[PDB]
Amino acid sequence: GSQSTSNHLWLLSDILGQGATANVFRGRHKKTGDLFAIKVFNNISFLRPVDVQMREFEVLKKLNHKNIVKLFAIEEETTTRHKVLIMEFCPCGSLYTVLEEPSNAYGLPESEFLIVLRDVVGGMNHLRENGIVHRNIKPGNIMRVIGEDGQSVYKLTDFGAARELEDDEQFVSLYGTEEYLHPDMYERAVLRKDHQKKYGATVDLWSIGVTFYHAATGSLPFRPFEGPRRNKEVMYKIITGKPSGAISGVQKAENGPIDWSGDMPVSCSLSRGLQVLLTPVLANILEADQEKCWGFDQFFAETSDILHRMVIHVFSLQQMTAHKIYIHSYNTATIFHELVYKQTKIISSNQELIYEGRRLVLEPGRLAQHFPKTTEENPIFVVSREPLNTIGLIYEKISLPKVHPRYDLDGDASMAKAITGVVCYACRIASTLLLYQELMRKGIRWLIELIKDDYNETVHKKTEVVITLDFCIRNIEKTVKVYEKLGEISDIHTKLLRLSSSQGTIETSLQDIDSRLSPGGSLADAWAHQEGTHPKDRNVEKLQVLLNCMTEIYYQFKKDKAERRLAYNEEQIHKFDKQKLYYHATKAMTHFTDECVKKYEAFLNKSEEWIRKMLHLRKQLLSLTNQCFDIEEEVSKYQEYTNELQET
Amino acid sequence: GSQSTSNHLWLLSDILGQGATANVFRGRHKKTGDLFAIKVFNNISFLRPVDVQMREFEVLKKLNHKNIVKLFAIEEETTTRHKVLIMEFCPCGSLYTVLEEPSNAYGLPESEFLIVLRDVVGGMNHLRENGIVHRNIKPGNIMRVIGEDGQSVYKLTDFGAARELEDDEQFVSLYGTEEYLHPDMYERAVLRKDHQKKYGATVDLWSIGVTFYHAATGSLPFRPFEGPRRNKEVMYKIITGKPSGAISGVQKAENGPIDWSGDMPVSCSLSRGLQVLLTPVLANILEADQEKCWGFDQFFAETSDILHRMVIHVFSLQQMTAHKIYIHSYNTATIFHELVYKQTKIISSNQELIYEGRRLVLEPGRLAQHFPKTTEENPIFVVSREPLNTIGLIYEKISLPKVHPRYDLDGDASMAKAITGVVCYACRIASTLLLYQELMRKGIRWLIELIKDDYNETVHKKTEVVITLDFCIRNIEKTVKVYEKLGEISDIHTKLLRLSSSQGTIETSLQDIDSRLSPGGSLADAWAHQEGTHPKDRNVEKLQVLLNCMTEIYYQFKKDKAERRLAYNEEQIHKFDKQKLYYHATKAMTHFTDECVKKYEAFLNKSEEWIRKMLHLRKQLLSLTNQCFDIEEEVSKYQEYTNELQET
Numbered sequence A, B: 001g002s003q004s005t006s007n008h009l010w011l012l013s014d015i016l017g018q019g020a021t022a023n024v025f026r027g028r029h030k031k032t033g034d035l036f037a038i039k040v041f042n043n044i045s046f047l048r049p050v051d052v053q054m055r056e057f058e059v060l061k062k063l064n065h066k067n068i069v070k071l072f073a074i075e076e077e078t079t080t081r082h083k084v085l086i087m088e089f090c091p092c093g094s095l096y097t098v099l100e101e102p103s104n105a106y107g108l109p110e111s112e113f114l115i116v117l118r119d120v121v122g123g124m125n126h127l128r129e130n131g132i133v134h135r136n137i138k139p140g141n142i143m144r145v146i147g148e149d150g151q152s153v154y155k156l157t158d159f160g161a162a163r164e165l166e167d168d169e170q171f172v173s174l175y176g177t178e179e180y181l182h183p184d185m186y187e188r189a190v191l192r193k194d195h196q197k198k199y200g201a202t203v204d205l206w207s208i209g210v211t212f213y214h215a216a217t218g219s220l221p222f223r224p225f226e227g228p229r230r231n232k233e234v235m236y237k238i239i240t241g242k243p244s245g246a247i248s249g250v251q252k253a254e255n256g257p258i259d260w261s262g263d264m265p266v267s268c269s270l271s272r273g274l275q276v277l278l279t280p281v282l283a284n285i286l287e288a289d290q291e292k293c294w295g296f297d298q299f300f301a302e303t304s305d306i307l308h309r310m311v312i313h314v315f316s317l318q319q320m321t322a323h324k325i326y327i328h329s330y331n332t333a334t335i336f337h338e339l340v341y342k343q344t345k346i347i348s349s350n351q352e353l354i355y356e357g358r359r360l361v362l363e364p365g366r367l368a369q370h371f372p373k374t375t376e377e378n379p380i381f382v383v384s385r386e387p388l389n390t391i392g393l394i395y396e397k398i399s400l401p402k403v404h405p406r407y408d409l410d411g412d413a414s415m416a417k418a419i420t421g422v423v424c425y426a427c428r429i430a431s432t433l434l435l436y437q438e439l440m441r442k443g444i445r446w447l448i449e450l451i452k453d454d455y456n457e458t459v460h461k462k463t464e465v466v467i468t469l470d471f472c473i474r475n476i477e478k479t480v481k482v483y484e485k486l487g488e489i490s491d492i493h494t495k496l497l498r499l500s501s502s503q504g505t506i507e508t509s510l511q512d513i514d515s516r517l518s519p520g521g522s523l524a525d526a527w528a529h530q531e532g533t534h535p536k537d538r539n540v541e542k543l544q545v546l547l548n549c550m551t552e553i554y555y556q557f558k559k560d561k562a563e564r565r566l567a568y569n570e571e572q573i574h575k576f577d578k579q580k581l582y583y584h585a586t587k588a589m590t591h592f593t594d595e596c597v598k599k600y601e602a603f604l605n606k607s608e609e610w611i612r613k614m615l616h617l618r619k620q621l622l623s624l625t626n627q628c629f630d631i632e633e634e635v636s637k638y639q640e641y642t643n644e645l646q647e648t
């Protein structure tokens, strides 16, 4: 069976989505053969008043955006003469399709997540300008397309639950999915509890809030033990009893206590600087009370505050940590040091910056626009003088789910995704560990070369200091000899001889430091090229190979799950590949824990020692340099004492 | 239909390859279900003597290697009781399968090519140790597998043309493919011309030589106008009339002159340093005369000479060129400067090295093993003082093949590969251009910061010079005054006053240079962040997107070519996608020539100017620094003249 129109034709076999009122089919144009999404209304929809079915058509006419799926034309089917919608086709799937990829099981990358935020807001903002509410915002209703620049672009669709609504106009009707439903709408739609309430446009922001937490963590904010489906009552108690500010809540036992948390889970894949901005945003937009809830202006202000911010990559040698500093293009270096202090706890005055081999000096009022180009591979380093605990990288240690001998195809494919998702997360940490050690080797190399510059300039000063002093003591000796031929002077020589003797000891102790900076002087960076891992070890490429064999089985298990039943051939191979998948995953985790992690552990342990070796040396080099300056400001009073004896 | 054995079973539908004597089928083990390649001999093979069919089994028993497809067992078919071979399965295809990928149409990458060389030699070397000749070495007979580390691994197979042969033992029988055939064997196998000749083990090296040229360029060395198939006679005249040393020869007209070349084509994707080692190797192993031909020792010596070499990435700012220096781990920096001079034409003494923000100094005898880690993204820069022409990147400008309105499915899929291969090459150049400009910005930034160090130390010397001079002239004035109270000296003051006046002019002209190094002093690198392209332009990602749409159509055209005939649906869509493929390719080439290339052209033009601005300034800064040293060696004769007047 297949339907057709005047300018379009589609198969009933190609179904993009299946909704209540209508379905959406992958179809082609009759003349050009180009792909378009055809939405066909079923007869059930025609048993609604003439105003409801009118809006959805009058809505798409007024709406056209880059973050909204473009409606090209409205035509009639050849037989039923039903109104069909010619929508823009998005072959890349929906946001739901993306979140099914095992790599995103523990949250989207920091890059693809910001795109989602950028496009969703932009689509919702365009709905706000026209005054259209959606009331059904789910990852399934957010499509994804590949732009000309490769960057993903997200558009909103499925406006079957949409209608024209004024800025302050309320309603009583119900729309939306279960998990992404507002506490007040969940009260009537799921538990069905009428306390005589009305709903504004705040219900859109909740559906957005739940969706956003799902993209960054890989799971829903509020999770009962049985789940939102198996136990609907617990789901409602969490959202209506949630403390103001909390962004998540999960019970870990059947009919037990609920664990609320006002912070992102460690499993998240976002930077620390991004979570600082995100957490308060999710806190206020997620609450039952309309008073404490945010408005669109307060929503857009904070989101546009984040999207306008650029990113300056900063790596701290002292703590061995990587940071993404989210700063505005119009902020100064003063605000920059504040933002770095908030994460790394380093005082603004102790922050010495290093970039591409050289130390970096910042003007107190230079804008962030003119800051040097930074990447994770080549960021700006921050080494402190004040001692700090080397924390390193923090990640949630996650193991493989237990495998049942059960044959359940739905369970195997679901186990396949989960277990492929754990290896994807393990591979993500391994590649991060490799970056930390490599930036460490580059940072330490740059640091020891920088200290040599301090040593060299100090010596140049010491040579400049010793010349003035040796001439001064030589010039007075001639003066006191012509006196004997024909109090102060005696008191001057005492200090001068003591200075020359102390200057001599400095000269010797500086050679000791030079012996420390010398190759193999305990401060050498030769240890770093042994202890930890190297890019030449190709540990990540190894993990990726096993992961390639795992993702091959997983996508095959989906097609086996899609068949519902399998022939004898595909059945027994599925039983065989189930252990092969497990033997691949266990080999990876074994290789991950025994090779990648351990070599990084030993690198972190030997890093702390060298840091303490460095901090000690820079202190001694500091004092000796200051002693050269103390004499420098002392000879300024000396060079004008004896040399000014010849005024007239 | 399907055959089976005692421990194995395979379908006759799954065919890996089809040869003369036997075929190879993708099969599975009965118990484990693991994949193995089953080779089944046809009845035609049984009409050969008992010695010929014996060897191939006795050969695989004696041979087991990492670069040789492992034979696991020899079993008998259930019905025919024919001897079947259980071979190692290589799902990644053969070398022929790899060369069909459009990206490798103009030659393999420098990385995947060296792996081929490493594995082929290693496989051939293991054949040499056992004394087994192959006589059928083709890209189809070289399999590829993904190692545990992700690196490709190539193994030899199809030993149907193989037999035991001593180190000096010859033969008269014939084996091999047409294009990869030795001139003496081509003389009897294709043109069939018996001049009473015998063949040694040199015939293997020719089949290797032709294969290697096919992997680096993407085409065969000797190409007639019609081709090696449509015109067999011309093929023979090229290989038997080839000048000693030439590695290629192509006639560009029907029945016309042959164009010989002893150098790699510009379309090649190998570095300049790798072609220097490769060219002479291909020259001697490719010749009819056994006298001038190379032996395995002379073959292995040069190939192991290359494979033992490491790679030091070097970028020349002066010529705006990237270089791969192939050096041994036991070579010194003396040999290193020689290897750099051979490519960049820069004298060993004028070579000033820069790495990660700082200038690099090399010990005359330091081994290459301890050289700093280098990559293309972070290589060692070489800036000269002697002027050099800025060549930049050199590539062959290749356009799209003309598209016929003809419907020929074989022609369309072949046109699809070719036209997808041109966009792949265009995308390769674009990503290289992006790297050249980025390394240029980093190199120039590092350079101007380095010149500031030279300026600063010169000032420190000038301040050190001016102090001695000002004291010297002050010390003599007191001496000549006590003389008047109670020739040389007069001649000394003349030079001293002239030195102090010249020192004053230096002080002023140094401030001029400081005004040149100052932001916006015509030597600023602010121009580089405007003129050329940036990674933020995402030009490569754009080209990749169109290329993704093209590679989607190409693989679909292969399946359409495989069907031989198409249903009406797939037929007309093929006709529609043919222009869609062309509109994608033309949009890419248009975007490539008007955006990527042009912005790079303007960057190269503004680079030459700044280089001339830099070379001029460093000269003036040099002379002024030398004038400070000239006075320094002049005051050493002065400070011991007047200050030594007080000996007794």
Ligand SMILES: O=C(NCCCNc1nc(Nc2cccc(NC(=O)N3CCCC3)c2)ncc1I)c1cccs1
Pocket (backbone or CB within 6 Å): A016, A017, A018, A019, A020, A022, A023, A024, A037, A069, A087, A088, A089, A090, A091, A092, A093, A094, A097, A140, A141, A143, A157, A158, A160
């Ligand atoms: O409108 C709706 N709901 C929104 C959803 C349907 N709507 C559209 N869906 C696409 N495209 C699309 C979709 C889905 C999945 C995929 N891709 C995959 O799963 N793949 C393909 C590769 C392998 C796995 C591409 N375009 C346009 C539209 I409009 C409604 C559906 C039923 C009532 S309302």
Ligand SMILES: O=C(NCCCNc1nc(Nc2cccc(NC(=O)N3CCCC3)c2)ncc1I)c1cccs1
Pocket (backbone or CB within 6 Å): B016, B017, B018, B019, B020, B022, B023, B024, B037, B069, B087, B088, B089, B090, B091, B092, B093, B094, B097, B140, B141, B143, B157, B158, B160
């Ligand atoms: O031995 C022979 N000649 C060498 C060739 C055949 N021999 C083997 N071939 C594989 N594996 C294989 C092969 C080919 C193609 C591919 N892959 C593809 O084309 N694909 C798959 C993905 C889509 C495109 C994988 N293993 C083992 C062997 I042994 C002979 C063949 C007939 C007489 S002799």
